[PDB]
Amino acid sequence: ETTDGVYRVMTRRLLGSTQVGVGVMQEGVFHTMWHVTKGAALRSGEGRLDPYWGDVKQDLVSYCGPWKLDAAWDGLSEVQLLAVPPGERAKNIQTLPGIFKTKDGDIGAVALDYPAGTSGSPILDKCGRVIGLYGNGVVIKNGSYVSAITQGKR
Amino acid sequence: VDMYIERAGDITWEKDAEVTGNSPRLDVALDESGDFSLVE
């Protein structure tokens, strides 16, 4: 299967079947975060998906082709995390991103907390475009989680 | 071999979506290992 959409990333190596993350299929390419697969090949039914591009520092990887997602947060509008938690149905969560300010510019961030296996869930704009992936973030003085909106280059 | 993917949905904006979370502005650094950290 290669239909566009959001997919769970599963492994049967540990106990039971375990969800290690999430990703996006678009234009024949599968997009997830590097720390989900560590760059390993992936099975899709009886087919195989081989890595094509990745970068540990961006924490991103693509399979079967180059990174295809190029929408970006507009800096103003609310977005939706399409969270896909282990063992739970996909749910849209709407939020106004905050901002990670770095030495190399500002990136959107979403202050929503989910299980680790939710890594790679897409963040969307009101047009349905994927503006980045959820799950590379920080923990604040509160103890709560804030994820960058991590987007690649097309 | 080890990992496999399973479809979980369309990627679509939901009209009636739950709205939540705040909008913090945070100084962070990104190290060569791809880990974000809070800057002093």
Partner: peptide
């Protein structure tokens, strides 16, 4: 973030 940042 489950403990962590990921």
């Amino acid at each position: 973030k489950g403990x962590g940042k990921k």
